[PDB]
Symmetry: C3
């Protein structure tokens, strides 16, 4: 199991969501965040942090590469600021209503 955390442009949420759902994703969490990247000592009057959305998608390992490709293709515009993806390990997943775990708590297959 892995967590895919994708930081995207806010306007891209629905395009990314549709891509993910059509690829078989059946869960995801979205956070409002602000950030900076490489910015191709500070100011008291201006703000370097830009609004983004943080998508968190917990998947099985066999899904990761597909998910990444779907996100990148849907989120990209070609302009600096398109976002960044971080993949990290997940040890266990539990569905609260039922107590089901791992693939049972993630998968479209029940």
């Amino acid at each position: 199991m892995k967590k895919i955390e994708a930081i995207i442009r806010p306007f891209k949420l629905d395009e990314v969501k549709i891509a993910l759902v059509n690829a078989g994703i059946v869960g995801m969490t979205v956070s409002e965040v602000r950030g900076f990247g490489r910015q191709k000592r500070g100011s008291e009057y201006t703000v370097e942090f830009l609004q983004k959305l943080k998508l968190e998608i917990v998947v099985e390992d066999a899904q990761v590469d597909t998910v990444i490709d779907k996100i990148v293709a849907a989120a990209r515009t070609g302009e600096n600021g398109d976002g960044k993806i971080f993949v990290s390990p997940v040890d266990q997943t539990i569905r609260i209503r039922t107590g089901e775990k791992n693939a049972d708590a993630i998968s479209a297959w029940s």
Copy 2:
């Protein structure tokens, strides 16, 4: 050390908090998020993302199973949408005020 990330119904925060504190938890972070799960191509007029709270609780490994059980018991209602828990590894924890690490930065025992 592990991070327990629990996505719960907003109204359940205080019931879950009380359960955790009574089980000996002495730290946690809460985020406002939106999400979807299995939803037992999109719309321009309606919103599939539902408001939830993201609880992040960093614990020692011996605490994990207890914490999960306390969260599930307090958060559950039986209706779809009760939430989901993800456990992930933590390599190091540091308390900023003192520089203490790991168990010293987590534990109720000082």
Copy 3:
């Protein structure tokens, strides 16, 4: 690659940002959160969760100790509530605009 998650006092954002940028950091994400720590059964009228900012900084492993030290030095005040840092593994990083990975998606060196 590691994720450094630093929970800090809101007023400290710019001091911490400046320290990180001067140490060579060229990316970070900030979240509004609420939390509690050790609090040196609840109430219906009062709120134990305190506003904090969650900084997420994905770095290469050689940067971690420097980053931690910069954060702690900039964020500390000496009063309870100064914050907490969690370090966790990252398996892969992808820049959305270009598809670059790992160090190429993190580093100041291109």
